[PDB]
């Protein structure tokens, strides 16, 4: 006559960490055309509201 | 005379209402307007300004 017993306890603790970084650079020719008046329109509002418009 | 009084009330109100003026729109202290009016009121066949006064 043979009797057996058996126990077991497991305990697993895990940790993850994932860091992602991306930089998608897109070259459109349209964005180059819109560059033109970007700086100039700064001094079109200066001209209209601070300086004399008659010769 | 009641019918005549009402017409005169309308005729006189039209005389006092009918007054014409020229109105310049610009910034509240843009000294160009004063110069522009001074030229325009006197003789001024040709007046030179910039695009921002927009006479039309």
**DSSP secondary structure letters along B24-40:** --S-TT-THHHHHHHHH
Residues, chain A = 55
CA-to-CA dists, residue A52 to A28, B21, B47, angstroms? 40, 24, 14
Helices and strands counted in chain B (H then E) = 2, 0
Q: Is A54 in contact with B52 (Cβ distance < 8 A)?
A: no
A21 to chain B, closest Cα gap in Å: 48
Q: Is B53 in contact with A54 (Cβ distance < 8 A)?
A: yes
Residue B51 has phi, psi (to 5 degrees) of: -70, -20
Alpha-carbon span A55 to B48, nearest angstrom: 6
> Around Cβ B43, how many Cβ atoms within 10 Å?
6
Q: This structure's resolution (angstroms)?
A: 3.6
Residue A12 has phi, psi (to 5 degrees) of: -115, 125
Q: Rounded to an integer, what is the distance from CA A47 to the centroid of its chain?
A: 36
| CB distance B11 to A33 below 8 Å | no
Alpha-carbon span A42 to A49, nearest angstrom: 12
Q: Is B50 in contact with A49 (Cβ distance < 8 A)?
A: no
């Amino acid at each position: 006559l043979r009797n057996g017993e058996s126990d077991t306890k497991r305990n697993t603790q895990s940790q993850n960490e994932m860091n992602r970084t991306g930089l998608t650079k897109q070259y459109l020719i349209d964005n180059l055309q819109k560059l033109y008046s970007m700086r100039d329109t700064i001094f079109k509002t200066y001209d209209k509201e601070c300086f004399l418009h008659i010769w | 005379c009641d019918e005549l009084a009402e017409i005169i009330l309308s005729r006189f109100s039209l005389i006092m209402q009918s007054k014409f003026s020229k109105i310049f729109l610009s910034d509240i202290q843009d000294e160009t307007i004063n110069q522009f009016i001074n030229k325009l009121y006197n003789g001024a066949p040709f007046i030179k300004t910039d695009k921002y006064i927009d006479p039309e």
